[PDB]
Design an enzyme around this catalytic site. Structure first.
Site, PDB file in Angstrom:
ATOM      1  N   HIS A 161     -36.500   1.254  17.636  1.00 26.16           N
ATOM      2  CA  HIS A 161     -35.949  -0.048  17.219  1.00 26.16           C
ATOM      3  C   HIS A 161     -36.662  -0.695  16.014  1.00 26.16           C
ATOM      4  O   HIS A 161     -37.167  -1.808  16.070  1.00 26.16           O
ATOM      5  CB  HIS A 161     -35.912  -0.997  18.440  1.00 26.16           C
TER       6      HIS A 161
ATOM      7  N   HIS B  70     -28.923  -7.043  14.536  1.00 23.11           N
ATOM      8  CA  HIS B  70     -28.743  -6.849  15.968  1.00 23.11           C
ATOM      9  C   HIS B  70     -29.962  -6.482  16.847  1.00 23.11           C
ATOM     10  O   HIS B  70     -29.873  -6.618  18.058  1.00 23.11           O
ATOM     11  CB  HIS B  70     -27.528  -5.925  16.253  1.00 23.11           C
ATOM     12  N   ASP B  71     -31.067  -6.027  16.255  1.00 21.18           N
ATOM     13  CA  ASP B  71     -32.261  -5.667  16.999  1.00 21.18           C
ATOM     14  C   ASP B  71     -33.528  -6.189  16.306  1.00 21.18           C
ATOM     15  O   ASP B  71     -34.618  -5.675  16.572  1.00 21.18           O
ATOM     16  CB  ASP B  71     -32.370  -4.144  17.091  1.00 21.18           C
TER      17      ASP B  71
ATOM     18  N   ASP C 236     -23.840   1.341  17.791  1.00 22.16           N
ATOM     19  CA  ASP C 236     -25.118   1.289  18.490  1.00 22.16           C
ATOM     20  C   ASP C 236     -25.306   2.551  19.374  1.00 22.16           C
ATOM     21  O   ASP C 236     -26.415   3.021  19.614  1.00 22.16           O
ATOM     22  CB  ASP C 236     -25.158   0.016  19.340  1.00 22.16           C
TER      23      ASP C 236
ATOM     24  N   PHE D  51     -26.643  10.984  29.462  1.00 23.00           N
ATOM     25  CA  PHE D  51     -26.316   9.902  28.551  1.00 23.00           C
ATOM     26  C   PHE D  51     -24.908  10.090  27.944  1.00 23.00           C
ATOM     27  O   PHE D  51     -24.117   9.165  27.919  1.00 23.00           O
ATOM     28  CB  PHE D  51     -27.384   9.863  27.450  1.00 23.00           C
TER      29      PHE D  51
HETATM   30  O1  LIG Z   1     -29.942   3.159  25.272  1.00 25.50           O
HETATM   31  C1  LIG Z   1     -29.854   3.426  24.091  1.00 25.50           C
HETATM   32  N1  LIG Z   1     -29.615   2.487  23.162  1.00 25.50           N
HETATM   33  C2  LIG Z   1     -29.533   1.169  23.470  1.00 25.50           C
HETATM   34  C3  LIG Z   1     -28.266   0.429  23.208  1.00 25.50           C
HETATM   35 CL1  LIG Z   1     -26.911   1.227  22.530  1.00 25.50          CL
HETATM   36  C4  LIG Z   1     -28.167  -0.923  23.513  1.00 25.50           C
HETATM   37  N2  LIG Z   1     -29.209  -1.584  24.047  1.00 25.50           N
HETATM   38  C5  LIG Z   1     -30.395  -1.002  24.325  1.00 25.50           C
HETATM   39  C6  LIG Z   1     -30.623   0.343  24.062  1.00 25.50           C
HETATM   40 CL2  LIG Z   1     -32.172   0.998  24.388  1.00 25.50          CL
HETATM   41  C7  LIG Z   1     -30.049   4.876  23.695  1.00 25.50           C
HETATM   42  C8  LIG Z   1     -29.880   5.326  22.378  1.00 25.50           C
HETATM   43  C9  LIG Z   1     -30.060   6.659  22.030  1.00 25.50           C
HETATM   44  C10 LIG Z   1     -30.416   7.601  22.997  1.00 25.50           C
HETATM   45  O2  LIG Z   1     -30.631   8.941  22.727  1.00 25.50           O
HETATM   46  C11 LIG Z   1     -30.380   9.575  21.479  1.00 25.50           C
HETATM   47  F1  LIG Z   1     -29.077   9.322  21.141  1.00 25.50           F
HETATM   48  F2  LIG Z   1     -31.248   9.075  20.550  1.00 25.50           F
HETATM   49  C12 LIG Z   1     -30.596   7.134  24.401  1.00 25.50           C
HETATM   50  O3  LIG Z   1     -30.974   8.035  25.372  1.00 25.50           O
HETATM   51  C13 LIG Z   1     -30.589   7.887  26.742  1.00 25.50           C
HETATM   52  C14 LIG Z   1     -31.515   8.651  27.636  1.00 25.50           C
HETATM   53  C15 LIG Z   1     -32.912   9.177  27.531  1.00 25.50           C
HETATM   54  C16 LIG Z   1     -32.464   8.324  28.746  1.00 25.50           C
HETATM   55  C17 LIG Z   1     -30.400   5.778  24.682  1.00 25.50           C
HETATM   56 MG   LIG Z   2     -30.393  -3.959  21.126  1.00 25.65          MG
HETATM   57 ZN   LIG Z   3     -29.418  -1.204  18.597  1.00 28.17          ZN
END
Ligand SMILES: O=C(Nc1c(Cl)cncc1Cl)c1ccc(OC(F)F)c(OCC2CC2)c1
Ligand SMILES: [Mg+2]
Ligand SMILES: [Zn+2]
Length: 331
Positions: A80, A120-121, A238, A292
């Site tokens: 992030h 957004h982050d 996202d 995921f």
């Molecule tokens: O949650 C996510 N993103 C996120 C969003 Cl979209 C919104 N709010 C918080 C988070 Cl952490 C997010 C984004 C990317 C991931 O993996 C890869 F694509 F890089 C992932 O892995 C799941 C898994 C390991 C347990 C999880």
């Molecule tokens: Mg976020």
């Molecule tokens: Zn994000």
């Protein structure tokens, strides 16, 4: 202004030719712009769409704001940081250009979606909402345990607009500022994963009653319909890492797991219960990516693909391929 070395000069421009494409490599962009991918790509996106002209935003004010915004993304947070915000902004810029939504959104709505993606982050601490709530952090106390981080990001993004030299919306009318603010709050609060199921369900309804006119473009009558597509758009962006080429997806996975495991460690030091996917000693990165995609990313993106049929088929195929690749890395 960016101080892009004379050596990274054309490398950057060569990368920016893929600006409007899903295959753009934001890692390459960050490396050629002296780790200023958010500022860089936001400037590029605003010139391409000619948003600086339409909303009379001086180039100096835009750069000054984006630079300060980018600096509020922590460079020591693995996932992030500003590269992810840049990635979400550029991915949103591409989704807004998808043929089925052509001319459906006002310039003001295009501005809101990209601005939202960008902020957004912002100022993400590298921990989840549930961690902040379980540890009675100042932010959870501040926001009453509801969409703690999402509310914060919005608070910081709008606060950086208060000084005149950073106010990119100074030439909007009072009315435009108020509508843009409403849309941005809405979209950013919708990136809270706890709203994911609620969002997917409403989008499935939209698909069922979708009316596409003779032009081959979706018909969205009311503001409710448009903001519904925009919330889902930023949400898909996202959650777009597994829809990108495998080379990009694996680097994103490396980043997210480094962040998630760092939170596992913090939870362990504090004697809290470790979230199972967050535990570096037991969790299989490969099984978790497969889970995921099957249970979160594929369900959303197949629904999105239905609404914009057939613009998103490539995305769906890349998603199934990447899924099968991770499944093949499990013994
Ligand atoms: O949650 C996510 N993103 C996120 C969003 Cl979209 C919104 N709010 C918080 C988070 Cl952490 C997010 C984004 C990317 C991931 O993996 C890869 F694509 F890089 C992932 O892995 C799941 C898994 C390991 C347990 C999880
Ligand atoms: Mg976020
Ligand atoms: Zn994000």
């Amino acid at each position: 202004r960016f101080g892009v070395n004379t050596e990274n000069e054309d490398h950057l421009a060569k990368e920016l030719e893929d600006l409007n494409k899903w295959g753009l490599n934001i890692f390459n962009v960050a490396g050629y712009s002296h780790n200023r991918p958010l500022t860089c790509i936001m400037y590029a996106i605003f010139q391409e769409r000619d948003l600086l002209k339409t909303f009379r935003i001086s180039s100096d004010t835009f750069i000054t704001y984006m630079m300060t915004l980018e600096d509020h993304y922590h460079s020591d947070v693995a996932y992030h940081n500003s590269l992810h915000a840049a990635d979400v902004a550029q991915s949103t810029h591409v989704l807004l250009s998808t043929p089925a939504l052509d001319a459906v959104f006002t310039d003001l709505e295009i501005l809101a979606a990209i601005f939202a993606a960008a902020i957004h982050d912002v100022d993400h601490p590298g921990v989840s909402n549930q961690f902040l709530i379980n540890t009675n952090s100042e932010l959870a106390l501040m926001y009453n345990d509801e969409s703690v981080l999402e509310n914060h990001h919005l608070a910081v993004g709008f606060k950086l607009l208060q000084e005149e030299h950073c106010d990119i919306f100074m030439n909007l009318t009072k009315k435009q500022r108020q509508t843009l603010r409403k849309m941005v709050i809405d979209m950013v609060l919708a990136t809270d994963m706890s709203k994911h199921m609620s969002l997917l369900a409403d989008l499935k309804t939209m698909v069922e009653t979708k009316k596409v006119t003779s032009s081959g473009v979706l018909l969205l009558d009311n503001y409710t319909d448009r903001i519904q597509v925009l919330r889902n758009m930023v949400h898909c962006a996202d959650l777009s890492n597994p829809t990108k080429s495998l080379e990009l997806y694996r680097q994103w996975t490396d980043r997210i797991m480094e962040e998630f495991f760092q939170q596992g460690d913090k939870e362990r030091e504090r004697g809290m219960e470790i979230s199972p996917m967050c535990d570096k000693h037991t969790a299989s990165v490969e099984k978790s990516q497969v889970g995921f995609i099957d249970y979160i990313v594929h369900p959303l993106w197949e629904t999105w693909a239905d609404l914009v049929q057939p613009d998103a088929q490539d995305i769906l195929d890349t998603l199934e391929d990447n899924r099968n690749w991770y499944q093949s890395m499990i013994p």
